[PDB]
Ligand binder design. Structure first.
Ligand code: CL
Ligand code: CL
Ligand code: CL
Ligand code: CL
Ligand code: CL
Length: 405
């Protein structure tokens, strides 16, 4: 609490960077008398905070390292092996007075190599590499929205026919461990990336993106065909001669406050298994880097509705239980939406009413109202056209964001 962590996932340079700062004034310490005790205390605090940063790294289209831990795909000791900062000094280079700082960097390949377990790779013009331009907003496969690509340790490349073109297991494992399956780049670097993709790369535009976490570029079949056409080009996949260009927001992911530990990921795993077992219709869950969002589709009730249907009583029961599984030290943002009724005034009020009713229903199930904030967005944030019943039902929803408090 006297110790604060700032951290950035630098996908462009392939490193996770952290700065841990000790506020001496807050910790009741003074320089130079307490330099050693203060420095040792910062070194004492650093391992757990660094561990939490590393859990936040996106591994693939669905999971972060913390999720993989929860699924027992990796061991906590493999992560803590990476948080030794004894090669770094405790300095006064902090921008704040009466502060000490400890900086630590870990290559992203150190995390990636924990997931490389395969033995051998599985398997026009000749090219020296593959350059995917995945900048901008990309249509999301299987959805109506368009979103930018997120970087991760193990992206996949799909064709528009959803043939799998590139995957971790296609890479020689030694090479996967040495320099990952891709490098992410910026158009502003004005680099050839000759090291990665040589002088004559195959330049390809991303036509879409796949994944819960929007990680997998989708490329035109004609472009996929070029890759698969020659041994020379197929060897590019085996060697990992692949660059993905993306936007700057994706290239530097700032790790938000506060940091969540392994227990957040364990609790989310429980929530997911719970919802999967309850099979509550039209309830989905997704995580951000330190939030969870439960989305309840086809919510029709409002603040002035009669006592809600039995079937809805059961669903809100399931939601309430799921929310509670994330523990007592959270708060909730409940946001209502409507389908496009061509009635903006009504949509505005209705979306607020929907969120209000959800909040009231949850507070009769043990979630104190002081923990809840409500908002309504009318039809202004659609996730589908409002043409069919099914698509209108998708828009008509309440999103519950679980936040640290
Ligand atoms: Cl001081
Ligand atoms: Cl030192
Ligand atoms: Cl996915
Ligand atoms: Cl509606
Ligand atoms: Cl209106």
């Amino acid at each position: 609490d006297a110790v604060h962590t700032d951290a950035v996932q630098d996908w462009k340079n392939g490193t996770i960077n952290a700065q841990l700062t000790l506020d001496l004034a807050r910790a009741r310490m003074r320089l130079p008398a307490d330099r050693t005790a203060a420095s040792q205390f910062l070194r004492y605090k650093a391992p757990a905070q660094l561990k939490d940063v590393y859990l936040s790294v996106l591994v693939d289209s669905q999971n972060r390292v913390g999720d993989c831990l929860a699924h027992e795909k990796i061991r906590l000791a493999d992560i803590t092996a990476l948080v030794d900062a004894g090669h770094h000094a405790v300095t006064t280079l902090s921008p704040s007075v009466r502060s000490l700082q400890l900086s630590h960097q870990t290559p992203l390949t150190a995390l990636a190599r924990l997931f490389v377990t395969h033995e051998t790779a599985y398997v026009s013009r000749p090219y020296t590499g593959i350059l995917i331009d995945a900048r901008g907003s990309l249509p999301v496969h299987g959805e109506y929205v368009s979103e930018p690509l997120s970087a991760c340790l193990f992206p996949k490349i799909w064709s528009t026919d959803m043939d799998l073109i590139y995957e971790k297991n296609m890479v020689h494992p030694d090479r996967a461990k040495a320099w990952g399956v891709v490098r992410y780049g910026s158009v502003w670097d004005e680099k050839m990336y000759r090291d990665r993709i040589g002088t004559t790369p195959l330049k390809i535009i991303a036509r879409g993106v796949f994944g819960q976490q929007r990680t997998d570029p989708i490329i035109a079949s004609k472009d996929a065909a070029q890759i698969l056409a020659r041994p020379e080009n197929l060897r590019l996949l085996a060697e990992g001669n692949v660059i993905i260009l993306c936007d700057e927001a994706a290239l530097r992911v700032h790790v938000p406050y506060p940091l969540v530990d392994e227990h957040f990921y364990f609790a989310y795993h429980d929530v997911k298994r719970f919802l999967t077992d309850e099979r509550s219709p039209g309830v989905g869950v997704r995580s951000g880097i330190n939030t969870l969002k439960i989305t309840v589709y086809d919510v029709r009730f409002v603040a002035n509705s009669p006592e809600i249907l039995a079937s809805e009583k059961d669903r809100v029961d399931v939601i309430a239980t799921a929310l509670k599984k994330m523990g007592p030290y959270t708060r909730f943002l409940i946001e209502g939406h409507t389908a496009d009724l061509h009635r903006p005034q009504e949509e505005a009020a209705l979306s607020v009413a929907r969120a209000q009713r959800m909040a009231q229903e949850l507070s009769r199930r043990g979630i104190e109202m002081t923990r809840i904030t409500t908002a309504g967005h009318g039809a202004t944030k659609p996730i589908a056209p409002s043409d069919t019943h099914a698509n209108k039902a998708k828009n008509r929803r309440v999103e519950i964001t679980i936040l640290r408090d």
